[PDB]
Prior knowledge:
This is part of a larger assembly, with chains A (273 residues), B (213 residues), C (174 residues) and D (298 residues). By secondary structure, chain A is an alpha/beta fold. Chain A has 7 helices and 10 strands. The relative contact order of chain A is 0.08. With 174 residues, chain C is mainly alpha-helical. In chain C, helix 1 crosses helix 2 and helix 2 packs parallel to helix 7. Chain C is flat. The chains are: A alpha/beta (273), B mainly alpha (213), C mainly alpha (174), D alpha/beta (298). Zinc ion binds next to loops of chain D. Chain C: Belongs to the CSN8 family.
Amino acid sequence: SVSVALHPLVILNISDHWIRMRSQEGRPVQVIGALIGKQEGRNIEVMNSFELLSHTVEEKIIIDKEYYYTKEEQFKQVFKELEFLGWYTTGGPPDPSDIHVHKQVCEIIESPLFLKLNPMTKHTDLPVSVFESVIDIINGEATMLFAELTYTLATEEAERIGVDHVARMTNSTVAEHLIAQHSAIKMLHSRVKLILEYVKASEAGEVPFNHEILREAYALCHCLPVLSTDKFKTDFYDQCNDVGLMAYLGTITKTCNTMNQFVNKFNVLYDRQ
Amino acid sequence: NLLEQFILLAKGTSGSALTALISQVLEAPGVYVFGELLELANVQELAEGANAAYLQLLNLFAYGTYPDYIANKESLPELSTAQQNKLKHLTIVSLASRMKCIPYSVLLKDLEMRNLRELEDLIIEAVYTDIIQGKLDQRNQLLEVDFCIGRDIRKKDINNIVKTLHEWCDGCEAVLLGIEQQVLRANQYKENHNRTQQQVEAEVTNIKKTLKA
Amino acid sequence: FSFKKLLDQCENQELEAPGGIATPPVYGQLLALYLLHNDMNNARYLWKRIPPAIKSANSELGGIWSVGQRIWQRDFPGIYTTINAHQWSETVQPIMEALRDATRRRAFALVSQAYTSIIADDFAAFVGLPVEEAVKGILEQGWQADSTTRMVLPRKPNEQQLARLTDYVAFLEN
Amino acid sequence: SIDEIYKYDKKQQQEILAAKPWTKDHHYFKYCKISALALLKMVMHARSGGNLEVMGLMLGKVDGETMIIMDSFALPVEGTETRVNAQAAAYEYMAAYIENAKQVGRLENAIGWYHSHPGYGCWLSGIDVSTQMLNQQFQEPFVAVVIDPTRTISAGKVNLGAFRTYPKGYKPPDEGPSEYQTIPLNKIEDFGVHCKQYYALEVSYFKSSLDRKLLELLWNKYWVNTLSSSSLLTNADYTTGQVFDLSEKLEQSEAQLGRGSEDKLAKATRDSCKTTIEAIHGLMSQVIKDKLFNQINI
Ligand SMILES: [Zn+2]
């Protein structure tokens, strides 16, 4: 059980790989690639991901270890602090072919991860799923299977700006800033209102009484206000006063410029040369 | 989920078997919310008879505190060390639900601990149970809680939930309205300034044209 | 509240005037109101421009200026021993009582803010009351005191945030 | 279909390359399209470079009057803004990476080069202009891309510019828009000297159908980071540098006023306005966050 942090760059890489292969081959085909990231204690984070070269004989898939090693040297040349983490594929639920390829990959690292992306999906949530290998004994026979992990989307400023720009692709400045904040606050409002409705509907009586959801709603309601402490208030007011002083200096500079223009015009008009 | 198994195996039991099962589930590690067991019609019917003490104990463990147990020690049946530890953990959770920076004095008073080492060991155990996430500050005599689980709720508590969620929704709507108004004001100001500058330039051009002729 | 409006009314009545000279009751009310509000410069100039005939006709202006001089010298025992020397009939009594209360409050605040160890006799002189009850009543207010040395230890006591920022940005960007 | 642009036509590319129409004209290439993945990789690499500079290569194609970019790959250089290209390490790396990508399915060819100008705008300096001139003289087409990973974070919008130079001795006929760009004092002479030898193409971004679906699915979980950004803390050294540069420019403007290019006070005022507006935006974001979260006292 290790906490996993995902990066939208990995998902974009996988989707572009699949789209490119489908367009090149005329018909959809599954792709196999590798992941790259950093592990700190029990926190695994993925950052980038390249593609691996594979062949099929009979009904089995084999990965070119020579190509993998050349790519490993190439990526270590650039990303010095990054390391191998696992492999990724496109499809549905795991298959015996996936178990075979995982067994093949396990000869390289100790416990590689496994990422699965589903291009053809009908659900509402992201089709990305993360698995790890677990070896068990069932009915006196040794078999290694998959265990699903829970992943969180990692935070990065440049990544956030790039992803938002790509998703949006669209006459002031306050305008734009406030519009972005508005979109996010709108999402929050929607979600909190749907939760309040469920809670009110459950209280009046319209849906079966659920205890876990109501307890979690109580816990959520007990989390407000967030950080009402004196040290936080002092830090917040420090920031506010700093920005206020910067705005004061900027206003003074602008007024000095306007004053200079007025003085120039007055000197030109009311002087006899 | 041990509570699901305890509910499943509690269908046919009653009386002494029910009380023994209640004691076992209260002593069982890991389970910290007892809502469905209290919701059981059989358990709620246990009130009539001479075993209402066990129902009162279950109610105390669902919604209760160590000072409540101390005040009602005589009526309730005796509890073992594991049950007392669970009640202390639930007291810590109840305090952290309403206060996010708990002083040491109130914790010591509530849990009836004598030295700081016992209280800090208890808080460390509660943290390790993954039912409360926080840090201990010795210099200021504080415990700072980042996360605490939601304890059991009554039927009349949900009014507070709906009130708080209504307040949050109203705040979000007010913020959205303010953002819209500010955007409109900024755009209007920019367009007004541009129009005024253009008008002044046009007047200057007209004056120059009529003067140069 | 009840004194600011009276001060404004007296000021306007003096300004209009039947030829510059106002009635002596209005002069006394205005002087005592200036003393109450700690407008020492205004009171000093008001006394200077009072005609000598009005000064000689009414003797209460002399006592009022005695109170004013005691306030000007910042001599609290003088203020307290000069306030309780004369009286009138409802014209200046409530405002002089308010002045006494204001002087008491100001002395308390000054002693609290500009002292860490004050002899009990000096504190009693500053406040105005004699020593015994003042030392009795400081403790109920939280001020430490100790006998055989009489050294009292005084103790020292919105949705428009976005609008202003938007205004600043709109001005800077123009 | 939208994925049609992702189809690589070897015959059409060969025909276009062998029937070069950009020779007769000079401003032939006027539109520059970039895929979503290429833009994201460029931005993340420029950001992870830090304060130093990083440079890579770009793989794409051409469709008539426009230049399409599909992929981008970094090359090591140890970065650190070395003198120029490489101790031959990058010289081997480019060919090695292209050959390795050829046998996987990345069958497109190089179209330009990108690099970062962290904190001092998006333009081509003298050495950049010479490099692009040399590249276009022999291998055609080729486009330069300049990124500003620091101004991107500061302003909330990507600072990406695609440029192409002019042949030696060619004098372009006026037509200079020359929108204002803030540039520090130590890098203003190069920008002034080398400014008419290149022109900026109009840049647009595109993405595939699966990419659009995945992004619209990802927003449902990515909306948190917008509300938990706190951009006023991540960019403080940049603001300090901007204030230092602005103070130096103000000193120069005062010296010009005392003495006897034109009206440096206006440029200093514009720089101060930009910096202050960015700071106030960063503050009002936190004010909104406080109003949303800290006041909803249960
Ligand atoms: Zn450069």
